[PDB]
Amino acid sequence: TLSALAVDLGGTNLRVAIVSMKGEIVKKYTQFNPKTYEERINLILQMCVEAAAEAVKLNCRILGVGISTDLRTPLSDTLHLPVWVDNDGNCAALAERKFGQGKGLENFVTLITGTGIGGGIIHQHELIHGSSFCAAELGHLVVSLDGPDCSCGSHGCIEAYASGMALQREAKKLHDEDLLLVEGMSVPKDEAVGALHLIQAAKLGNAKAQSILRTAGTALGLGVVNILHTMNPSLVILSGVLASHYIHIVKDVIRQQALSSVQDVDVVVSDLVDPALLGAASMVLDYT
Amino acid sequence: TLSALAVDLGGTNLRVAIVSMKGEIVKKYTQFNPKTYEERINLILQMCVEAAAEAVKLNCRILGVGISTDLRTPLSDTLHLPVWVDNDGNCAALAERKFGQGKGLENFVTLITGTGIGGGIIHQHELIHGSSFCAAELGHLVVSLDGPDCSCGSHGCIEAYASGMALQREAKKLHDEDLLLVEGMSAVGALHLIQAAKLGNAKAQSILRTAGTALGLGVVNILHTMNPSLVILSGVLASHYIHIVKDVIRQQALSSVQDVDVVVSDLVDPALLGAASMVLDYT
Ligand SMILES: [Zn+2]
Ligand SMILES: [Zn+2]
């Protein structure tokens, strides 16, 4: 069974999976993601060697290793396999291009809407990497002369407005002022307010919450509009835990403010589970 | 002299030229830009056979025609020549690629900064045209949730801020309140707003700081989308905006994209050069 190993060096955890050619995630390991790199590489090797060994047991011909994020040298040497590496935003795009709603499409965008915001740009069937390799930094599209502060150091970034972290900051500010919870809401002692709480408050009648969310969706929307006026893609795939939430307002912002010339674009929510791993996998699968 | 027939369609006058493969504008014909397309289409073919007639007298093989902006139908039939067509922004870019500071560059962007704002994106030595052929509508990058109104109907467009019309609108405003003229000067417009600024006016300077910032933020948006190796500012207002654009980037773009070079264009009649370049790029 033709396959590849996919590695996801993401938030908190480090995941490695055996992925089939048809996109099935055969087996999936998750572990702590060491902060320091010397150690992160070691863990990857081990998890790969185990995954690889298992693939031999599980009747799987592994073609190579793909990594979403000096990683190539040590892995190829040890595992006797080719290694491909690209960033999470690009891998998200590649997941859609191979297994998702990007199949076929010549020119499309994948915007990751979760803890943070990022994305990938397919054009002429291929990723746009950029001269400095850092193309498609979609979280730091600036839609304000004087916005909220952003973790990149600037302000106005659509990540500063519409990220999961962004919303959590807003959710905490209101809860600290006793302006978040409404008509019954109760937060656990352990758990701590986040975007769902902000949304639930809005959906349960919280005007302050609704306002905050309106701005976050508008900013993101204008982010997408900027993409449309730059790339004129045929499709935009919102992906991640906040995609479902943001799709309605993004379309509205597109109907409201985008040029007539680019309104035939379609915006969708991704169906893909574990896109990072699928994307990592898709590099190996595609080449070999 | 292996050459091409460049043709320009812009505001006010209509232009036509013979352009060498080297990039030399041999002859240039200007004229009126009629009310109607029936009037406008009649002039073009006449200017072309006029020009096409001359070319041969100046020993020049016209390989075809190029047009900035079913016109191939009348011309190709009449002139017996391949005719290419593409918009002003793209031609601005193609001009820089074949003849300007984009020579050899895989990924760069040309941003027109004049009466309007617009441009072209060259990625992998090629134009991005897009899904519905509306790529690089750069003047309508949004940098505000509540900006100035724009010609497109929306608001917060960099064109709405930094265009020569944008600046002209602001020039009329101040001058209506008699607060634009300042010790040292005597149809109001952008160039005056700049002098008033230069020669001491704070409201002028204030209006400009915002304009230049809005534009730079647009440029930043481009950098974070495309990660180009170079950004060429082209037009009557390029010389003006380049310093502030360089600053907004310095002050707000990611470390990753700071290696970008911003430059002002060298080309004269880039519209015509870009048009001609289409004919010359398909030999
Ligand atoms: Zn940012
Ligand atoms: Zn506009």
Residue numbers in the entry:
A (entry chain A): 406 to 474, 499 to 717
B (entry chain B): 406 to 474, 499 to 615, 621 to 717
Could you share sentences copied from the article?
UDP-GlcNAc 2-epimerase/ManNAc 6-kinase, GNE, is a bi-functional enzyme that plays a key role in sialic acid biosynthesis. Mutations of the GNE protein cause sialurea or autosomal recessive inclusion body myopathy/Nonaka myopathy. GNE is the only human protein that contains a kinase domain belonging to the ROK (repressor, ORF, kinase) family. Wild type GNE forms homo-hexamer in solution, and allosteric regulation of the epimerase and kinase activities of GNE is important for the normal function of the protein.
